């Protein structure tokens, strides 16, 4: 095992809302990437009933399914 390990839950419990934006992201090249207001991890927001259908039956794209 590795010296530093973190399960999924522990990783999440260590999230803290922080409105500070790292300077690196204020770079002009990453305008399309910049998210000013901090977003919490998606793990905490519940799945939509549509999001549930896909994740439980088939997640593959049409494109890959056509190569079988």
């Amino acid at each position: 095992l590795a010296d530093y390990r973190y399960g999924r839950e522990e990783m999440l419990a260590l999230y803290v809302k922080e409105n500070k934006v790292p300077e690196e992201l204020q770079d002009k090249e990453f305008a399309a990437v910049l998210q000013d207001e901090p977003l919490q991890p998606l793990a905490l927001e519940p799945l939509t009933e549509e999001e549930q259908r896909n994740f439980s039956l088939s997640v593959n794209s049409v494109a890959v399914l056509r190569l079988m």
């Binding site: 090249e29 998210q35 039956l57």
Partner: protein
């Protein structure tokens, strides 16, 4: 005090021609430094056009030419639209949390936003290490809760190079 990561990781971004930028964003060494970046990054599902996020260990460049990748490969899952963002999150949380159990064989992960699909991949150092590639495969299934009969593909980077006799289809 912050919780260190086994390795330092570096975020990279690229926007293909609709011209791989692959410019690096920043590097982080703890779980807190990670959330500071990721919380202020647009979800891949919201990116327009042909964009990529790369999350690689510090020192590994998101390219097969890198010394850690030239003999490596990547597991690949091609997803329908609307799932990359959560899978991408689960994938990197496992990687940063050292949940894969293959030593130093992991190199990084990629999420690629495309037209009618998204592709997420996880790269490793030596493709002939079947013990490692098989273990990464099963870990991918569990961390992403893949339903049964999901399609995945392992590609060796060297086999992705175009060269005479292997140029793929081309116009005339």
């Amino acid at each position: 005090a912050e919780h260190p990561l086994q390795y330092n990781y570096t975020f990279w971004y690229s926007r293909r021609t609709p011209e791989q930028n692959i410019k690096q964003i920043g590097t982080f060494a703890s779980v807190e430094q990670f959330w500071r970046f990721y919380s202020h990054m647009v979800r891949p599902g919201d990116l327009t056009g042909h964009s990529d996020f790369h999350l690689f260990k510090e020192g590994i460049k998101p390219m097969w030419e890198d010394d850690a990748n030239k003999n490596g490969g990547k597991w690949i899952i091609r997803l329908r639209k609307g799932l990359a963002s959560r899978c991408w999150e689960n994938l990197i949380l496992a990687m940063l949390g050292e949940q894969f159990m293959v030593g130093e064989e992991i190199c990084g992960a990629v999420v690629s936003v495309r037209f009618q699909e998204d592709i997420i991949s996880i790269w490793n150092k030596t493709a002939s290490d079947q013990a490692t590639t098989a273990r990464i495969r099963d870990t991918l299934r569990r961390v992403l809760n893949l339903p049964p009969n999901t399609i995945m593909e392992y590609k060796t980077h060297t086999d992705s190079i175009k060269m005479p006799g292997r140029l793929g289809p081309q116009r005339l």
